[PDB]
Amino acid sequence: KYVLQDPIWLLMANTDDSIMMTYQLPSRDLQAVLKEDQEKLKLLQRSQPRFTEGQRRELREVHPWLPTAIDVTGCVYCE
Amino acid sequence: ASSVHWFRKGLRLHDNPALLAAVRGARCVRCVYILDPWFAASSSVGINRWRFLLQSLEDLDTSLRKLNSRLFVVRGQPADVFPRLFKEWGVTRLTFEYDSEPFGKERDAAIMKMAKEAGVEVVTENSHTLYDLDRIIELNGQKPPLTYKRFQALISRMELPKKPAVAVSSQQMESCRAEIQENHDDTYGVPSLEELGFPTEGLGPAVWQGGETEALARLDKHLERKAWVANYERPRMNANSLLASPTGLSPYLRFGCLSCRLFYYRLWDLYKKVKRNSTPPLSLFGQLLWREFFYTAATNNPRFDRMEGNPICIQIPWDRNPEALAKWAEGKTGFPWIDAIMTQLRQEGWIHHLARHAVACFLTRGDLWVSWESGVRVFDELLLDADFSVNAGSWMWLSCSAFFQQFFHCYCPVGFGRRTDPSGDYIRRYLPKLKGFPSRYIYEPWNAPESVQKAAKCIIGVDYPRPIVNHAETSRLNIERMKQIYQQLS
Ligand SMILES: [Zn+2]
């Protein structure tokens, strides 16, 4: 007899029927949650990946010098 | 000369430049897989990958039986068993297939330090990949290609991948039956799922049968007119593509049950014959080249599978929400297109790469803003063809965290299904609480006339999950957060 356990993502989560069957995400404000990202980013933008001339050039060949795939209002099917 | 060939990947007798090495000078040799069934498995949810591994060893054993030998699964750690196995067997040398991935390398090295200081010889062939990955890296200023475009360029300028070795030997190996202890199965037998701690009652035939034998048969089906046309010529996305193909090869490639090179020089040969061209577009080999890319982009990157500490991953303020990650992982997002991909993944162990894209989008950039490195964790236990480099590499791109390729709009949790499979055949298959729903409503059971949910034996919020979020609502906000990370990005 052996019993393995749930993986970490379950153990760390309340997974009873009310969460599984009807938990909802919150409804928020844009400019609130926007600003917080800025602050964390100021922390984060340390590693930030940094390249050099040899590397920095290859992105122009694959990328628009980038907002291309994201410069939109929603995704593309319900907005 | 008495040696030992160690299996980890490369679970195959064919194209094994490492198993070949061991046998040439040898008097008598023995193969090994090393496992501590007692602690090997991480969770109750990872049955498919271990079942695949065990059928693989079992096949290896069958094949090695026809050589009057057998496979030796050794319980223990590649650190505690190796020295003992040295003394008990007086092994002159060790052969194993090169593992590129950072942690394997370290482990492999510290096990080289051990064999040298114990005076035992070592050879590694790199037959898990098409190329010697290191050379791709040196050819680029001893740094890894950052884009697929540059990756492609670099390998067109190098040699061609080695031909598949004629690995296997009979009358020159089959009679190396020097020692034959019949206490064998009791001590070196292939573990069962129960030793690993899995319950195997009520357990059907594996959708993805393990072994080299199933792999090679699959290669042949893969390369026949009907499979060729449908996969390599007129590729179209239908509800049928979502289904596990009898010709699918990704899991076999991951375990090494199939040689990526053999696959290579046969996909070439078939092109040469059918198109009458002996120099095929690079994109023909796309599924292999992307696997190579990643094995390359990660080999010198200990943290390839983590956001922070990874030199090529964009750092991003992902949210924590363990309940969200759980609902996703379980297939209870309340969005039938997602929930059914996640359900298939769990039962069967494979999903289509666009089912992957859709599911990776919903969790990261699209709707829940949860860190991709968590998706990688969930797939590491669930997905047959996932591994360190391939699984994380893929997730970085999908979430918009890496620069391997051009980004692309967020698939929709409701729309991208009903385009792909309008019938809803797929959803009814994996979510049978939703059988009696019309395809019209089915991708969105919340905005479907109440009468139906009453007259469909499942009502929303009671028998099936109410929608985690609502798409437009939350997707309207993450896209701006996404632009923000990119606006403020230098
Ligand atoms: Zn949408």
Residue numbers in the entry:
A (entry chain B): 1131 to 1195, 1201 to 1214
B (entry chain A): 21 to 510
Sentences from the study reporting this entry:
PER2-CBD adopts a highly extended structure, devoid of a hydrophobic core. In the crystal, PER2-CBD meanders along one side of CRY2-PHR and sinuously wraps around the region. With nearly half of the PER2 residues involved in binding, the two proteins bury a total 2800 Å2 of solvent accessible surface area at the interface, which stretches over a distance of more than 215 Å. In comparison to its FBXL3-, KL001-, and FAD-complexed forms, CRY2 adopts the same global fold when bound to PER2-CBD. The largest structural variations take place in two local regions, the interface loop next to the FAD-binding pocket and a serine-rich loop neighboring a secondary pocket (see below). The PER2-CBD α3 helix preceding this loop packs against the long CRY2 C-terminal helix at an approximately 30° angle, while the region C-terminal to the loop locks onto the same CRY2 helix from the other side. Together, these PER2-CBD structural elements encircle the CRY2 C-terminal helix like an U-shaped clamp. Superposition analysis reveals that FBXL3 and PER2 cannot be simultaneously engaged with CRY2 without clashing into each other. In the complex structure, these two cysteine (C1210 and C1213) residues face a pair of cysteine and histidine residues in CRY2 (C432 and H491), which are also invariant among vertebrate CRY1/2 proteins. Together, these four residues sequester a strong density at the center, hinting at the coordination of a Zn2+ ion at the end of the PER2–CRY2 interface.
